[PDB]
Amino acid sequence: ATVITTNQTGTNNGFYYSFWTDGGGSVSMTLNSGGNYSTSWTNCGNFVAGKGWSNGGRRNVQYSGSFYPSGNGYLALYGWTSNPLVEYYIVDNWGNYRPTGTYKGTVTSDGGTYDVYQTTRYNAPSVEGTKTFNQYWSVRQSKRTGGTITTGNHFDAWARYGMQLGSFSYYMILATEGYQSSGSSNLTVSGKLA
Numbered sequence: 001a002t003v004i005t006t007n008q009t010g011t012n013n014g015f016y017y018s019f020w021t022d023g024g025g026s027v028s029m030t031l032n033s034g035g036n037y038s039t040s041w042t043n044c045g046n047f048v049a050g051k052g053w054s055n056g057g058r059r060n061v062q063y064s065g066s067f068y069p070s071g072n073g074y075l076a077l078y079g080w081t082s083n084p085l086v087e088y089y090i091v092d093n094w095g096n097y098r099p100t101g102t103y104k105g106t107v108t109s110d111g112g113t114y115d116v117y118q119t120t121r122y123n124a125p126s127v128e129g130t131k132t133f134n135q136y137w138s139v140r141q142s143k144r145t146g147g148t149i150t151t152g153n154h155f156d157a158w159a160r161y162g163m164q165l166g167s168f169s170y171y172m173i174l175a176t177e178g179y180q181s182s183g184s185s186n187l188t189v190s191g192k193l194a
């Protein structure tokens, strides 16, 4: 097992991982065998951590385990595109705060209905440094921890709603995210190209 407490990306037991924190409170990620990781956080500022793939794509993502936010946290298939720069989220679980934005319609996927939203961040941290970019959101209408995410269903719905992804030149991870919160997660990811 390897504990991560400091910003970095890399590979562990055949899986890509990303850890990122603004440095508030206490945040750790433990990288275990195959696709397993755990997180522990107390009074965090903002962090995103998880395992997945060096590049995004159309992938049937299978995951399982636990996700226990006290306050604001997300469980999301998460990644970035280039040209345009986009931060994208397929959110299966959350805490006290449900992600919202400009409502674009729904998509049905993996036993659930997802609300689609677009938001925009100005001069914020990104995989290209301090940048302005849109965020694309699929938010499940009912919370869960575990199952399949057919990323194709989301990407295609986004495209029908005029939300175009760039190139899959950056990571795609099954992410734990917290904001001014405490919690834990213990997750396993796997997947294959549709």
Ligand SMILES: O[C@@H]1[C@@H](O)[C@H](O[C@@H]2CO[C@@H](O[C@@H]3CO[C@@H](O)[C@H](O)[C@H]3O)[C@H](O)[C@H]2O)OC[C@H]1O
Residues within 6 Å of the ligand: 007, 008, 018, 020, 046, 047, 048, 087, 121, 124, 125, 126, 127, 128, 129
């Ligand atoms: O060390 C470099 C990092 O600074 C950089 O990491 C990305 C920075 O932005 C992170 O996304 C934020 C997460 O919180 C959301 O609410 C915000 O909208 C985002 O700003 C992302 O997780 C990191 O990968 O990338 C390059 C690194 O070398």
Ligand SMILES: [Cl-]
Residues within 6 Å of the ligand: 111, 112, 113, 114, 140, 141, 142
């Ligand atoms: Cl649902």
Ligand SMILES: [Cl-]
Residues within 6 Å of the ligand: 101, 118, 119, 120, 121
């Ligand atoms: Cl916005």
Ligand SMILES: [Cl-]
Residues within 6 Å of the ligand: 123
């Ligand atoms: Cl500017």
Ligand SMILES: [Cl-]
Residues within 6 Å of the ligand: 067, 093, 144, 145
């Ligand atoms: Cl749960």
Ligand SMILES: [Cl-]
Residues within 6 Å of the ligand: 110, 111, 146, 147, 148, 149
């Ligand atoms: Cl499912």
Ligand code: NA
Residues within 6 Å of the ligand: 162, 163, 164
């Ligand atoms: Na658009």
